[PDB]
């Protein structure tokens, strides 16, 4: 075995029993991955100085009683993925100084766990995941008061008798993910701070009512369950995180301190007005992939602290969000909905909006003071705080002259809007602010914008368009990458794009009908600072 000062690290394979040739002064011993089929006390007892002992992933089945009692200084024992459940009553004797014990993967079952272990006064962490535990009887976690973290995921836990966690006053972390629980009738773990009940079959979740003591839960994960309702979390004031995603939660303060609510994939069709009041101080609200039809946050002071609002892939038809209501909203996701007509100043009233995704909708912009548009248009012309906008697949046929004249955004995407007739100077206000622009799949015949005039532009995309010539560059370009795939481009002379090479480092021309003879300087551009 490899040797280090006061530490022995036996390799993955090669040993059948615990070696007897190691120094008695060994303080750390690693034997994981080996064919050790048992732990007899005689060879192991020589190393009383052991503090860590990794027997993980061995074939151990029989532990001789008193084997781990002799190592008074042992602090961490790892028996993960062994064959303990095929056994040694009291196989693990008393463990006065063991701070961590890993038993996951052994396929321990209810009843054998209660006799396999012994007194462990100083146990801080216990891992029982990937076992065959089915029931948490009254007598499961006795004789370990100092436990602070308990791991029980990937088990088959269906039942939990009242008071199974009564012997764990200091527990702070309980992980019951990927278990078989089906209905939770109570919650009285005042000490607990993290609870993971995700990936279970829970149809209902309930807690204590009008308790005489406070609760310390801060992180509840109740997702991918069968929950049919939003749980009554009035007794959990300190909850900070809540992820009810992938449930069946139809909707018909308790959550004043919740900061991150994930309520997506929950068959929700309506958000009652009283609901959003309880979510004061919320900072993230994910309502994606619901059957929601309209968002009605018209009340002043609704969701004051919300920084993100995700409503993607709903059936949303209109937004009733009020002026100065979503004050702190930085990001608003709305892709995949059915927005057609809105009040012109819907998104302009969002005081601190920074990113707006409208892909897959069918909204139509308008230019405000320059070239006013029809009724029902949405006024992007004056969203001062906006910095990134997406209008992909909005079926916009005509873009107005003053579409973004007073919105200094940094990135704009208009891709896959077939037949987009860009009015001359439509993007005029973005010359000194925009850094990335995309117009892929528009099919437009000519660029109706002074593209070199965009001093701040860094990247551009014009792929899958009928374009034939580019506006004439005449100075050192701030552009860095330019994408021109599948277009009708025939020539790229220096008079048309010279000056790009000062900052350009990547180019795409494949699929275009370049003149085999007249391309000229294109071959030299391909030498350095170009590709394909």
């Amino acid at each position: 075995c490899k040797m280090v000062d006061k530490k022995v690290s036996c390799q993955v394979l090669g040993l059948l029993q615990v070696p007897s040739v190691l120094p008695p002064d060994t303080e750390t011993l690693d034997l994981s991955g080996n064919q050790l089929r048992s732990i007899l006390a005689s060879p192991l007892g020589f190393y009383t100085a052991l503090r860590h002992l990794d027997l993980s992933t061995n074939e151990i089945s029989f532990l001789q009683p008193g084997a781990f009692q002799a190592l008074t200084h042992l602090e961490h024992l790892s028996l993960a993925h062994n064959r303990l459940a095929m056994a040694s009553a009291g196989g693990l004797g008393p463990l006065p100084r063991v701070t961590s014990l890993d038993l996951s993967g052994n396929s321990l079952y209810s009843g054998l766990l209660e006799r396999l272990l012994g007194e462990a006064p100083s146990l801080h962490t216990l891992s029982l995941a990937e076992n065959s535990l089915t029931r948490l009887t009254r007598h499961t976690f006795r004789d370990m008061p100092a436990l602070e973290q308990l791991d029980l995921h990937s088990n088959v836990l269906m039942d939990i008798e009242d008071g199974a966690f009564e012997g764990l006053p200091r527990l702070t972390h309980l992980n019951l993910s990927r278990n078989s629980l089906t209905c939770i009738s109570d919650f009285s773990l005042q000490q607990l701070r993290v609870l993971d009940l995700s990936c279970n079959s829970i149809e209902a979740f309930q807690t204590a009512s009008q308790p005489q003591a406070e609760f310390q839960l801060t992180w509840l994960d109740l997702r991918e369950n069968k929950l049919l309702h939003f749980p009554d979390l009035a007794a959990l004031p300190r909850l900070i995180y809540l992820n009810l995603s992938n449930n069946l939660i139809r909707l018909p303060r308790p959550l004043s301190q919740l900061l991150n609510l994930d309520l997506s994939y929950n068959e929700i069709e309506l958000i009652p007005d009283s609901f959003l009041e309880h979510l004061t101080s919320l900072c993230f609200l994910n309502l994606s992939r619901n059957c929601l039809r309209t968002f009605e946050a018209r009340r002043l002071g609704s969701l004051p602290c919300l920084m993100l609002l995700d409503l993607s892939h709903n059936a949303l038809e209109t937004l009733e969000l009020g002026a100065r209501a979503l004050g702190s909203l930085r990001t608003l996701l709305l892709q995949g909905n059915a927005l057609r007509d809105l009040p012109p100043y819907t998104f302009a009233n969002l005081a601190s909006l920074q990113r707006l995704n409208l892909q897959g909708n069918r909204v139509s912009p308008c230019g405000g003071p320059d070239e006013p548009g029809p009724s029902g248009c949405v006024a992007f012309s004056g969203i001062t705080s906006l910095r990134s906008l997406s209008l992909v697949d909005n079926e916009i046929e005509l873009l107005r002259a003053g579409a973004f004249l007073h919105t200094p955004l940094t990135e704009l995407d208009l891709s896959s809007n077939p037949g987009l007739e860009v009015a001359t100077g439509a993007l005029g206000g973005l010359e000194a602010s925009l850094e990335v622009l995309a117009l892929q799949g528009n099919g437009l015949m000519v660029l109706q914008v002074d593209l070199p005039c965009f001093i701040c532009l860094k990247r551009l995309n014009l792929a899958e368009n009928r374009l034939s010539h580019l506006p004439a560059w005449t100075q050192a370009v701030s552009l860095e990458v330019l994408d021109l795939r599948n277009n009708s481009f025939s020539l790229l002379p220096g008079s048309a794009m010279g000056g790009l090479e000062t900052s350009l480092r990547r180019l795409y021309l494949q699929g275009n009908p370049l003149s085999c003879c007249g391309n000229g300087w294109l071959a030299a551009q391909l030498h350095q600072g170009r590709v394909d």
């Binding site: 459940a85 993967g105 396929s107 321990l108 079952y109 990937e130 076992n131 065959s132 089915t134 990937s154 088959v156 269906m158 039942d159 939990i160 008798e161 009242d162 008071g163 199974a164 966690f165 309980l174 990927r178 278990n179 078989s180 629980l181 089906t182 209905c183 939770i184 009738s185 109570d186 919650f187 009285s188 773990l189 607990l192 609870l195 990936c199 279970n200 079959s201 149809e203 209902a204 069968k226």
Partner: protein, 310 residues
């Protein structure tokens, strides 16, 4: 954090009444129950009651894997030909019992035994039937088949589970079936080499050993639970319902043996979302008045006899 203790049937029963009323109305294509008062009071006529009694009255594990094995028919050259050769209308498939018992060491283990034949005759329709060798002389009928013509060879499957089990437990050295042409009182295959064989399927000898989904009783009387007088027969029926939530059990490569049996009662079908649903149902015949003539009608899949997870 204790698990949910009990289920209140006093709500689910009424919620079943609500749905079964609608099912009764829908099965008869009725928007609302008909008016009962117009028809004069009196007994249902005797012939109609006889019809209603004719329809009412009676007339006349699989989850765990099964090891499959096959025993090939003896050669026709030595055991079969000498006394039961092939005739114009019959064939005789004989099997060795010693190797049959070798395939399945105990008769209790046998779950299924399919005698399989391959047919070369293609186009001529024929009626053929299967008999057991029952004694030194006699034969007993198993089953028959109508050979729908087809242009290509095809495999026939005859279920012989009971015969094969009887053969394992009491059979002699040599035994077999007769497959012969149908004929009345007033009036081919390979081997007669892909020859017929018995595809036995048995449990391996090494493997011989209010919450869960179940059917729960409910009796409905049309007069008081649904408040109906228009339905005259029967007075009520047992619309028992299924309850007991089936939890999804998250699998794992290494599982304790007594926990591997939890799948067979909570998720036998390996569904992504199991639910406790009816498995077996039988109809409810009724008599009722619309217009001025009684109507005897059969409503299908009304009673619940078993429930299963998905």
């Amino acid at each position: 954090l204790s698990t949910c203790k009990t289920i209140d049937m006093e709500l689910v029963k009424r919620k079943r009444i609500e749905a079964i009323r609608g099912q009764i109305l829908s099965k008869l294509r009725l928007a609302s129950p008909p008016s009962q008062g117009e028809v004069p009071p009196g007994p249902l006529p005797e012939a109609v009651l006889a019809l209603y009694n004719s329809t009412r009255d009676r007339v006349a594990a699989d989850y765990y894997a099964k090891e499959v094995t096959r025993v090939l028919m003896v050669e026709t050259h030595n055991e079969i030909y000498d006394k039961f050769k092939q005739s114009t209308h019959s064939i005789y498939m004989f099997f060795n019992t010693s190797e049959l018992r070798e395939a399945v060491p105990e008769p209790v283990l046998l779950s299924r035994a399919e005698l399989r034949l391959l047919r070369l005759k293609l186009k001529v329709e024929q009626h053929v039937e299967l008999y057991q060798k029952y004694s030194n002389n006699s034969w007993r009928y198993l089953s028959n088949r109508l050979l729908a013509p087809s242009d290509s060879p095809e495999w026939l499957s005859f279920d012989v589970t009971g015969v094969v089990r009887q053969w394992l437990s009491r059979g002699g050295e040599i035994e077999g079936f007769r497959l012969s042409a149908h004929c009345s009182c007033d009036s081919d295959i390979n081997g007669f080499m892909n020859r017929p064989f018995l595809l036995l399927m048995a449990t391996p000898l090494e493997r011989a050993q209010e919450k869960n989904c179940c059917v729960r009783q409910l009796y409905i009387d049309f007069r008081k639970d649904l408040g109906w007088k228009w339905i005259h027969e029967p007075k009520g029926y047992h619309a028992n319902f299924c309850l007991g939530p089936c939890p999804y059990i998250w699998s794992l490569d290494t599982q304790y043996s007594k926990v591997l049996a939890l799948y067979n009662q909570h998720n036998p079908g390996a569904s992504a979302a199991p639910c406790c649903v009816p498995q077996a149902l039988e109809p409810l015949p009724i008599v009722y008045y619309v217009g001025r003539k009684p109507k005897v009608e059969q409503l299908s899949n009304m009673i619940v006899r078993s429930c299963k997870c998905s």
